[PDB]
Symmetry: D3
């Protein structure tokens, strides 16, 4: 695959997808045993290790629909990946989404044109694989890890209009990857889920503290890993 | 309200929404105790009864986004309805979607322009209330009712020469109906809880039909799951 | 046909299309001789009787483009109907549309996506069959029944934006069916017309009285029936 | 106004709008008494004369929505024109539309973005003033001029590889031209009366051409109907 | 060709395209030797003469995308034209565009639907032929003729919204033809350029004087002619 | 700024923008004197050095409109960057576009919805700053570096089953990449100067690949033109 420097058999059937390749390194080095780096192409690191006997890969995606679409498509078509789990942050857009909540995205809205390019007059609604979702939910509920299940918004432009309106329709937060993941996974018959923590409140400008972030990042990765193994 | 002839207090917190008002009569009379008809306007019948210590209402919605939108808006704004559960059918668009499966719709695609009118360049993904969806899932699992959780397509044209159900199937979409996008959107807008529970009435892309007996089974399974889920 | 329980030959070549199936029953029972009910499917009643020797059917359509599209398509493809006349109400959006005017719709604007689904970048303008229209107009003018001829708006959402703008372009009123009727009739080479009365003024909130409604409903049905026979 | 060099009072209440300014000269000089040319700007000629006790003006519009929009806007806003009647040709897109038929356009479809720019998610259907359309119909019937009443397609691209005239024909659309949507929209916006009367110059979907003599006949029939309709 | 009354060989390989056919006559009669008029169809004059040995044609286009599209398509397909140069005016939309600047359009934005009809979900960006552009630029710079190189807006509706926004994105001015010229030329592998003078400032309402217009019109035609010969 | 960990004064006026942060390291270390790395956030490296008496910065942008938009916005708004030059590759979509040609993008088409979100019914054509484009052209000509000036297509989907690169090629579009529309749009919005200089990495519509040696040559030619153009 053009953007991934891996040999046959170097990437697991289950891949965690953080946006930041340095966070990919962090997750692998912190949570996994017998870690190997199978990709340094573009400095977008991919690693493979084991977690409680299960082979797991962790692959940086970059930011935005186009960047994640590249890596998801190559992981699927070139490396036969089956389960794809984004582990990221989002900006919360409602006050009832709390700083410690781990969010499981059922679906995502978008202003990306990726689907209108495919479907024209059809509004395509991306969907998480329910088995992965319910396994993640059960993993959180098993521990007492606070979890909220709803929809997100996949934005094409980091730097406001209608986020305001989307919040009024109960949308939980904004990030830049989920629509692409969910759509491409489903198109190839693979399983996908996006697990998200809150990096801030965008409407009130209320940031989260570094300590709060460290805790929720742990809960997120633990949920991702517990649910597949 | 203009389309529902009910006095305040006649409609329950929790409302099942078949498309067919004759099916609403059937549901209410078969499953519920001490049933009153509260609406006869346009023959779009609505009934209220009790199921295991709880008020349940059953309101026909009619067919298509605009029709169900009217009923859902009025139920929410004039009758303070909290929980809205569509109980209906869809045409399966994948072979792997079996005739016995009860479908729980996480989300719905659409060719309705209802959301584009509101959202412009935003593809709005409508979303089921997860609490209701999980309760329905659990109640199916409790009984062993076969269940599949995924997305549907909310079509504006039952008969469509320009149909892209072929493409939507390749993206894993389970089935086609005509109401869900509207239900999910309008409930979410007013902070109310919504879910669509669907049976399969045929496979659109093979033409293949289900038997009358098969439809009876799965309808029962669907209403059972629906009522047990809200207790 | 899936949604219509009629035997071969039970439905006339000319069908009146009220939205309300109870109004379908009312029209049939009040205006027609030797009435039979050929459809109770979904409680969306269809009846056939005679008016001055001519066989006439009256079929409920329900509300909205999708619902009428079903019944029009089945009446055309399964029952070979030739002339399709909607008899309904609309909300008037201009002050010069009076409470007693019977409206004949030449065409209709819409926010339904039904045509953009078919035509993409093309704005399709639905058109009434002129023969039916001119026959209706002549029937009204013959009696002195007040009639206004122009365009309407076919709305997808009963519960404002741009109705305001449409009024400024001379559009007469708002209803929820005409675009579908006109488009599907023309597509199958059949004849269609929508005859409408005023249920209220939407911009001023000015309602019509029950007596005013009863009179105009009579004038509308009499025009529909006089023009085909 | 910027595109019409007329002084106030030189333009009549009632204006015929050929696309071709040389045809405007022909109409005015052949049919009208005591004719003045009131505009030479861009060679888009405009003439005023009399027909049976009434002032009539004849203004070339040029080709396409943007061009006719300029003339129509200026005629309305600067010259208080009340009645605007396009007299022109279209290509037939159906076999059942005959070369001798004068077309009266009830409405027009378009691939122009002019209305989407204004109306967003609304498909605006432009509409002829019924009084003018009925007067034209009556004047044709009075003479036995063959007439067909229906819709046309207002195209932005005379030459179009991506053309959907095939589909528009299956929906009963009669013919293709390049002006009507603009005329009908802009007149309606300013509360003025508009109508397009059209002859058939060929069948686009067979390629088949009309003779010069056939075009002469039908042009006469069209102008006759037009002038007799306004008396 | 339907709209052009020319015999084979009457139109040069290089055509100047003013919007006004009277300006076509003016340019030909003033700048060219041995002038012939090859087209009077619709009074949309086309002329052919010589400039310093080079055969040159000057063809009126009319106003708007549809009108220019007709003449460009026939000049290309029926008369094999190679180089097509619009010589027109635009309304300047920025204060830094001066009344004496000759504008060379690199590209143009539009609210014409012509390209969305072709490309659907794609924003097509029309492009001037760089060879013609750079030759024009060098011709101006050779003389000291003031020249500004950027983008324009091709409007479908002479009689405001977003012109305001387009100015903020550095767009220079508004006219009604360039998108069509650039798109159709490129589609047929031919060379196109639009050279423009300022007829006024649209935002401040500041008009140019007749003398200023006469000077810039001369500079524009001289640049068009000098650059091809 | 949130994505760039630089203190004020560490980023130059003039910034080269490769997509690949490892290529930014390569450019800065190969071509520049006294280089500092000013950013390590997300491993999207950014370097500042000197070239012939001028500060030059080299910042990885990542792949696609949303990614480069973040970097470009932050460079402009937080670091007062004046000149932004993308140095990268594209896939050729025409046979007449040769592997050795350095491309200077006058404008870019896109299937990104970024401008439609802003502009509605307007097709926004983004535009290179002509001064920068002309300086690059001149510096290529000064050396005899083969150069082609034209448009590209900025794609949202590297892998696209619904691709219209076939049609875009017939309109003379030279090549496909994933960044230019964003660069040109956002620079123009903030009154800054932008240009994209591109090498060809293969022909997408024949499949045909360039050699490693050919890619080395043309990369050198591109960076040479880029640095010589800003002096
Ligand atoms: N194949 C199908 N296509 C569309 N709607 C269907 C189908 N099967 C069942 N339905 C549902 O049944 C109704 C019409 O019979 C629609 O409201 C729709 O919701
Ligand atoms: N086949 C046709 N296609 C498009 N326009 C036509 C056709 N026939 C006649 N016209 C009219 O004639 C003009 C161009 O000759 C256009 O303005 C258009 O209004
Ligand atoms: N054929 C191609 N299609 C899309 N992007 C390409 C191609 N060749 C090079 N690129 C550029 O390289 C990057 C991905 O390798 C993209 O950011 C894009 O800008």
């Amino acid at each position: 695959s053009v953007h991934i420097g891996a040999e046959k058999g170097q990437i697991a059937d289950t891949v965690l997808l953080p946006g930041d390749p340095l966070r990919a390194k962090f997750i692998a080095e912190t949570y996994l045993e017998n870690v190997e780096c199978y990709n340094e192409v573009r400095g977008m690191y991919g690693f493979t290790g084991t977690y409680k006997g299960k082979k797991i890969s962790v692959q940086g995606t970059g930011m935005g629909v186009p960047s994640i679409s590249i890596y998801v498509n190559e992981l699927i078509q070139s490396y036969d990946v089956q389960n794809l789990i984004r582990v990221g942050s989002c900006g919360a857009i409602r006050k009832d989404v709390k700083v410690r909540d781990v969010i499981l995205a059922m679906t995502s809205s978008t202003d990306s044109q990726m689907n209108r390019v495919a479907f024209g007059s059809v509004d395509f609604a991306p969907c998480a694989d329910f088995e992965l979702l319910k396994n993640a939910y059960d993993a959180a509920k098993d521990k007492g890890v606070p979890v909220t299940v709803g929809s997100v918004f996949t934005a094409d432009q980091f730097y406001d209009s209608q986020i305001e309106k989307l919040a009024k329709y109960g949308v939980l937060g904004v990030e830049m990857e989920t629509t692409a993941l969910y759509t491409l996974a489903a198109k190839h018959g693979r399983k996908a889920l996006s697990i998200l923590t809150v990096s801030d409140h965008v409407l009130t400008g209320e940031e989260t503290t570094a300590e709060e972030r460290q805790t929720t990042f742990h809960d997120m990765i633990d949920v991702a890993l517990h649910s597949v193994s």
